[PDB]
Structure 1
Amino acid sequence: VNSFSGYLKLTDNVYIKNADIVEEAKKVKPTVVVNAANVYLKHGGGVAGALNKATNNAMQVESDDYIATNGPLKVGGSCVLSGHNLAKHCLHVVGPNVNKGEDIQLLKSAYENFNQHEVLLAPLLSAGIFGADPIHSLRVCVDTVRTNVYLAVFDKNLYDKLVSSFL
């Protein structure tokens, strides 16, 4: 039993809710919240900008030190940093950004990072300003992630479409 509430069950291990991931993280304080990161951990907009704003920019400060030490992430890669006031840990995962021409096949590699964590609160990777089809992202998620993932979808209209079209 865990504290996630109001989710629709899609599969044995994948759950989905129309929710703001920031508010969901603030209430649940999950062990892991996933950020929709880029390789530079520049949290300007989308999910990343919202999560970072909720940490009062502490996420960005920590991220800048990480990059200064380690260099950029790979597309499809991840790193574990602090969850600040939102979660114990933040798993920063880089899905391909279609608006930069990155290969969508890397979306599966991105979701594989979730398997290193037993339970996660997450957005749909490569959705929103990353330009991929969210229906496709949900399919890759279900077909790749084997650990327990609680997906937060900000847009109510998109949430309903994702549920109604789910196979």
Structure 2
Amino acid sequence: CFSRTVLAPGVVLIVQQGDLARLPVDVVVNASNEDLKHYGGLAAALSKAAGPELQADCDQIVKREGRLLPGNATISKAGKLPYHHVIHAVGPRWSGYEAPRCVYLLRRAVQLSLCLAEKYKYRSIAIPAISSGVFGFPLGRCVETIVSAIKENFQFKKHCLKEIYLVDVSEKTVEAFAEAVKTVF
């Protein structure tokens, strides 16, 4: 654990190193593409551990609801992962020509992820540095946008959610999260 920040009474933000495929939390957020096709990065690790259940429920979801748009999130079965569900958030693909829009869409992915958690009555959620890998979002802007989006969501005391974790395997990204929490709070 790298930091702990009370967001509201009985609600904490925790930055931690760890593996989203195996955390003692209720649900996790995947950094997905629009097709819910988990063939790279975090998505691939999750899907591998999950067995084909997760990709198949995801195919049926696209084959039912249609392609997801950037900024949106949906939920699927988790298969063999230690969760009932995986929340798939589609971060934006970074363009330096549209940086404000990109920030908007990541904020949105984050907030919709939180809304889905609330809706399925979850009290703990873990979230990665959505968009900061293959999708190319500048790591610094990326982790501040996520932390700020989480800060806005609890500008009011009220929440099902009691613990929100920001998690990555790599320590640089985790440090980046811990710094963003300093700067933002």
User: Normalization by structure 2: what TM-score?
Assistant: 0.75
Q: Distance in 2 between matches of 1:7 and 1:72?
A: 36
Q: Distance in 2 between matches of 1:78 and 1:161?
A: 24
Alpha-carbon shift at residue 14 of structure 1 (Å): 2.1
Partner of 2:170: 155
CA contact (8 A) 1:10 1:16 kept: no
Partner of 2:120: none
Unaligned regions of 5+ residues in structure 2, if any? 118-122, 154-160
Among all aligned residue pairs of Structure 1 and Structure 2, give the percentage whose two residues are the same amino acid. Answer: 25
Alpha-carbon shift at residue 153 of structure 1 (Å): 1.2
Secondary structure of the corresponding residue to residue 33 of structure 2: coil
Q: What is the aligned counterpart of 1:69 among 53, 59, 64?
A: 64
User: Normalization by structure 1: what TM-score?
Assistant: 0.82
Aligned-pair RMSD on alpha carbons? 2.2
CA contact (8 A) 1:39 1:94 kept: yes
Partner of 2:112: 113
Q: Distance in 2 between matches of 1:11 and 1:95?
A: 26
Alpha-carbon shift at residue 11 of structure 1 (Å): 5.0
Give runs of aligned pairs for residues 92-131 of structure 1, distance below 5 A.
92-98=88-94, 103-104=101-102, 105-116=104-115, 117=117, 118-131=123-136
Amino acid of the structure 2 residue aligned with 1:88: H
Amino acid of the structure 2 residue aligned with 1:140: T
Amino acid of the structure 2 residue aligned with 1:151: L
Amino acid of the structure 2 residue aligned with 1:135: G
Alignment of 1:78 with 2:73, yes or no, is yes
Q: What is the aligned counterpart of 2:149 among 144, 148, 160?
A: 144
CA contact (8 A) 1:15 1:150 kept: yes
Distance 1:78 1:164, change over 3 A: closer
Q: Distance in 2 between matches of 1:7 and 1:83?
A: 27
Secondary structure of the corresponding residue to residue 36 of structure 2: coil
Partner of 1:55: 50
Aligned residues, how many? 157
Amino acid of the structure 2 residue aligned with 1:154: V
Alpha-carbon shift at residue 120 of structure 1 (Å): 0.8
Amino acid of the structure 2 residue aligned with 1:38: N
55-64 or 9-18: bigger deviation: 9-18
